[PDB]
Amino acid sequence: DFDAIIIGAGFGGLYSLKKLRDDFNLKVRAFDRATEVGGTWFWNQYPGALSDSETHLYCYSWDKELLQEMEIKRKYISQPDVLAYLKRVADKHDLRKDIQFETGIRSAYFDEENSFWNVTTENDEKFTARFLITALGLLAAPNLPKIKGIETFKGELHHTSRWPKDVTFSGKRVGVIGTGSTGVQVITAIASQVKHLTVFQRSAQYSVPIGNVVMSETDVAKIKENYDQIWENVWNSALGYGLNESTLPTMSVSAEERDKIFEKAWQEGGGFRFMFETFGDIAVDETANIEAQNFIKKKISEIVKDPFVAKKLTPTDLYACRPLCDSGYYEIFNRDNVSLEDVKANPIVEIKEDCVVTADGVEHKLDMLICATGFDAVDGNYIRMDIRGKDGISIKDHWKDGPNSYLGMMVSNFPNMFMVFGPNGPLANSPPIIETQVRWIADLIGYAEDHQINQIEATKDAVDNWTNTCSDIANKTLFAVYLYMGGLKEYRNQISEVSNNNYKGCLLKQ
Ligand SMILES: Cc1cc2nc3c(=O)[nH]c(=O)nc-3n(C[C@H](O)[C@H](O)[C@H](O)COP(=O)(O)OP(=O)(O)OC[C@H]3O[C@@H](n4cnc5c(N)ncnc54)[C@H](O)[C@@H]3O)c2cc1C
Numbered sequence: 001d002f003d004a005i006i007i008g009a010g011f012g013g014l015y016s017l018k019k020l021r022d023d024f025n026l027k028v029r030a031f032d033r034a035t036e037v038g039g040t041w042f043w044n045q046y047p048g049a050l051s052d053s054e055t056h057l058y059c060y061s062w063d064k065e066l067l068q069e070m071e072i073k074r075k076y077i078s079q080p081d082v083l084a085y086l087k088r089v090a091d092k093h094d095l096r097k098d099i100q101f102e103t104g105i106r107s108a109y110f111d112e113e114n115s116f117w118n119v120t121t122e123n124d125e126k127f128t129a130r131f132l133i134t135a136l137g138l139l140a141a142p143n144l145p146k147i148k149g150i151e152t153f154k155g156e157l158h159h160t161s162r163w164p165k166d167v168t169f170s171g172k173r174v175g176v177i178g179t180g181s182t183g184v185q186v187i188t189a190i191a192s193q194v195k196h197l198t199v200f201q202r203s204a205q206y207s208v209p210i211g212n213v214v215m216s217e218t219d220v221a222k223i224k225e226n227y228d229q230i231w232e233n234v235w236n237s238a239l240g241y242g243l244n245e246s247t248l249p250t251m252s253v254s255a256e257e258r259d260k261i262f263e264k265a266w267q268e269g270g271g272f273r274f275m276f277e278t279f280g281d282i283a284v285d286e287t288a289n290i291e292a293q294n295f296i297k298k299k300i301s302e303i304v305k306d307p308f309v310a311k312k313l314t315p316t317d318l319y320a321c322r323p324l325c326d327s328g329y330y331e332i333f334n335r336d337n338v339s340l341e342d343v344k345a346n347p348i349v350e351i352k353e354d355c356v357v358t359a360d361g362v363e364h365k366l367d368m369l370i371c372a373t374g375f376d377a378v379d380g381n382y383i384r385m386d387i388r389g390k391d392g393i394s395i396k397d398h399w400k401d402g403p404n405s406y407l408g409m410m411v412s413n414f415p416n417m418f419m420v421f422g423p424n425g426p427l428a429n430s431p432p433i434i435e436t437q438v439r440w441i442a443d444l445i446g447y448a449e450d451h452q453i454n455q456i457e458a459t460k461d462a463v464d465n466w467t468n469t470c471s472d473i474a475n476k477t478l479f480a481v482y483l484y485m486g487g488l489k490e491y492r493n494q495i496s497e498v499s500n501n502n503y504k505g506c507l508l509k510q
Pocket residue numbers: 007008009010011012013031032033034038039040041044049050051052053054058103104105106135136137138139381385420421428429430431434
């Protein structure tokens with residue numbers, strides 16, 4: 001028996017454990033398949049792995065001593081450092097004693113008679129708890145790509161999601177499949193280290209510089225001395241990325257001024273910065289979206305000296321969502337040991353013992369093939385497990401037509417279960433979202449313990465009304481199963497209205 005069981009020991013699960021155990025004095029256990037804390041920052045050890053938000057914001061804000069104590073080494077934070085930070089959090093707040101590592105949860109069945117969750121590990125261990133905190137998503141299990149004969153490759157075959165240790169690159173011909181955010185990081189990191197790099201791009205995307213530089217002692221002090229305000233700005237923003245979020249229309253200024261504004265964001269770096277600090281309507285106005293793209297296309301044509309290679313790199317879609325971020329990606333393609341294959345025009349048809357073969361019949365001889373096809377679904381990690389709520393219905397079935405929730409945290413027919421960083425949540429920097437949700441969920445659970453209620457469930461009406469809110473907002477924009485896209489501040493307003501009005505939309509049963 002526990003008051004709560006938590007699944008996941010990443011950002012989400014760790015803070016859930018801290019809040020529920022230490023601030024609400026609940027008896028709680030957390031579980032993870034991993035051998036240590038860190039979540040996706042434990043699993044993803046691929047070359048070039050790097051946060052998308054700046055170091056000083058990609059962290060917890062609730063421990064002020066930790067803010068002052070923590071190293072701010074570079075403007076953005078590498079995977080090994082995020083892992084060390086989360087391990088430090090675990091150290092300081094004595095969290096590991098309440099985490100069971102190497103423990104996959106196979107199933108969670110809700111008991112309506114006793115108003116609690118039956119949780120079964122993959123080693124057939126059974127636990128009971130009133131509440132189930134799911135801090136799971138969304139890192140997809142290493143699915144090898146569906147390519148004929150992939151199993152016959154005798155060289156190294158690595159998936160970015162399970163990057164083994166001790167990989168060396170020198171003297172080797174290497175191929176990478178995928179040019180999403182993960183592929184860009186790996187490609188940029190390894191190109192100078194391999195004998196030859198072949199990039200298999202199915203779909204080109206725009207990338208802007210991340211502009212990751214070392215932070216001076218003076219840079220760090222500016223942040224640490226003003227940390228309270230820096231966080232107040234996060235809570236009062238849409239993205240929580242530390243940006244001066246623009247309301248200026250792209251076409252309201254001259255062509256010369258517009259170039260100047262894009263150029264300033266380009267020099268500073270950051271994907272959301274280029275899209276949201278420059279102007280206020282890039283994700284909304286077609287003309288404005290095209291202007292932004294043309295700025296990046298022009299950069300591609302300038303950096304990549306071979307116009308034919310520049311062309312292949314240039315996305316062909318009419319409108320573009322957020323760009324990726326890089327630390328020298330387009331530069332790579334000027335190298336004599338790098339080949340770009342457009343495998344939309346010239347697809348992979350087979351993989352043989354020593355090569356990737358494209359539809360033109362060319363045998364791309366490889367010593368190593370890397371799958372950076374980090375391809376998933378937002379509710380993938382919920383669907384993967386056997387979760388059953390009311391009348392025994394599975395989450396797989398309830399979401400067969402797609403993930404729907406109330407406030408991104410509650411699923412109708414699944415009482416006493418609360419999602420952290422689940423589907424239909426806000427579009428923003430993750431750790432502020434996760435803090436926002438963990439604190440809301442805990443206050444609700446605390447409310448329940450204080451009013452002697454043992455069953456909390458979102459009504460179908462609240463769920464569909466959340467679906468509606470998301471839809472009305474989302475369809476204002478060009479892009480694009482909806483996130484809530486009103487921003488962090490408004491998401492915080494939405495959930496506050498719920499908690500401030502007796503948790504309307506929630507069935508509270510004594
Ligand atoms: C390289 C990289 C950079 C990123 N940068 C940013 C960024 O800058 N800003 C941002 O907002 N987001 C970023 N992300 C996205 C990232 O996923 C989130 O920031 C964050 O890691 C989510 O934390 P989480 O605790 O909710 O989930 P995770 O960190 O993924 O941890 C989930 C854990 O739950 C465990 N788990 C799940 N299911 C089960 C089960 N059935 N049994 C047992 N155990 C289980 C998993 O093993 C996993 O350890 C980045 C991702 C990557 C790969």
